[model samples]
Target: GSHMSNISLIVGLGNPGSEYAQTRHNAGFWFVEQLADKYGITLKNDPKFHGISGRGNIEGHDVRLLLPMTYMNRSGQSVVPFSKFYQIAPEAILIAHDELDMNPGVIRLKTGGGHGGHNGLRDIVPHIGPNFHRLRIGIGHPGSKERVSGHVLGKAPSNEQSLMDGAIDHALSKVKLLVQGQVPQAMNQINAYKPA
Candidate 1:
């Protein structure tokens, strides 16, 4: 139910370093890595942006994928500058990040929503406003609020990792539709997907 122009920037929020490489918090990194591989794009480090960025074409639409080098809480520091330099509006950006409320293998695409206590979203909202799109890659929660941090930073079980991988692959396959700003079509296909 949203009207979007064209998707120019696709941000995958995550902390840098090998320590966080396989954690549930890095689900966004996993998604963007898949996109880079699929498009034959190389995400190189850019000291200026404090992140890694790559550009490629999807369905004839030029798209940039970014992974913030900053910690999850400072994600906006990496995103805002790249966006401003490229002249990309907040509405033209799509942020893919881990969602704690949903279970593994669940993916939801939406535009302009509250951050839901996510530090990445909380940081991003102030710089970009809340009009951008979000590709919520669910990682589920650890039941108790106190365990949230450990749960996200911790490694997932083999089965859960498999489910997350499946979800990322599904989302990657639909990137073309998303970059074209056919969000409704992308949402319908992605939301209907259930990884068994």
Candidate 2:
């Protein structure tokens, strides 16, 4: 029962490069790829947008999918331009990225918050302010601050990957609710999922 501000853009934040493809930091990338795969939406290199871009319908809702090819820390550079071009309001955009505080496979839908320590979210704040929705894909913490870099940049084990996939699939199953502006319902269903 939230305001009906249907999402127009969904952006996934991650570093670009084959080596970074399967890393924990790329969980956002993986989510969008899986999403596109589910509906056969072909994402293309859109130089004007500085990212891989695709537009298609999901649950009868026309939307755009963006994956910033710029490094994770430079996400705003790619997002702001496309956002301005479309005149999409900040609240209508959802940024999906990895969350280190939660365990692998945990997913949360939240709107408006500080970036915490995520560089990708941090970079976008100044340009857009902090009012957008977030699809937080959990990748778990590495126990110590010093190990954070190596952990996020490294690949997750097969088990963790499976759990992450489970969480993503769960989220996808509820995409209709998410895109429809059923924020509370979407968050309730998505955030409560427990992967085996």
Candidate 3:
């Protein structure tokens, strides 16, 4: 748990526009926003990042935060340049995105693996490779392939909102461990977290 990570950039994957802001698909934006807020960093439009971005310090590490404005399937377009400009290696990056397979209120931390059919993850790999860390924020599945699209883009019901918020809060609590590169500590607590 005490082991630390050497993260340089933290990116949250989501589409652009206010309409998609509250959808289940934008949960990654939600996490980044909260984390950014904790450090008093403001995410604003910057051509340098190709999306909304901010700079801050976390546990003394100069952290770069990004929320790619590109659509879910083209997230790499924004992420690639931002990381390149910052010279952040794939292993030093952490991506936060929604996890349809996990139920609402659940969040998990992981290192390089497959994309699991997630469009954001799928696109980013081509540019950054598969060596990044992931903050998987859960937004319950709809139970049918046909409804996957609608479910993610749709708003969560009032009950589910609480769960999602709880999950985000839990993720926020463990980020310090993550930036410290405490993968085992972060994963152990996050994967095992239960929402109220």
* TM-score, every prediction: 0.96, 0.96, 0.94
Candidate 1 residue-wise lDDT, 1-196, digit = tens = 1135678888999889999999998999899988889888889988899999998887788888899999999998999888988888988888999999888999888889889989899998988799998889989878899999999999999988888889889999998888887888988998887997
Clashes of 3: 4
lDDT of 2 by residue, 1-196 (tens): 1134687788999999999999998988988888888877789998998899998888888888999998999999899988889788888888889999889989999899999799999989899999999989999888899999999999999999998889988988877786798878988999999986
Clashing pairs in 2: none
What candidate 2 gets wrong by more than 4 Å, as runs, is 1-4
What overall lDDT, based on C-alpha atoms, would model 2 receive against the true structure?
0.88
Worst 10 residues of 1 by lDDT: 1-10
Worst 10 residues of 2 by lDDT: 1-10
Q: lDDT tens digits, residues 1-196, model 3?
A: 0123577788998878889998998999999999999988888997765688998888876788999887899888899888777678888888999998899988888899978878999988987899889999889887899998899899999889899999889888888887777778888998998975
Q: In model 3, state the lDDT of residue 57.
A: 86
Select the stronger candidate by TM-score from 1 and 3.
1
After superposing candidate 3, which stretches have Cα over 4 Å from the reference?
A: 1-4
Off by over 4 Å in 1: 1-4
Q: Order the candidate numbers by TM-score, best to worst.
A: 1, 2, 3
- Candidate 3 displacement at residue 180 in angstroms: 1.5
Better of 2 and 3 by TM-score: 2
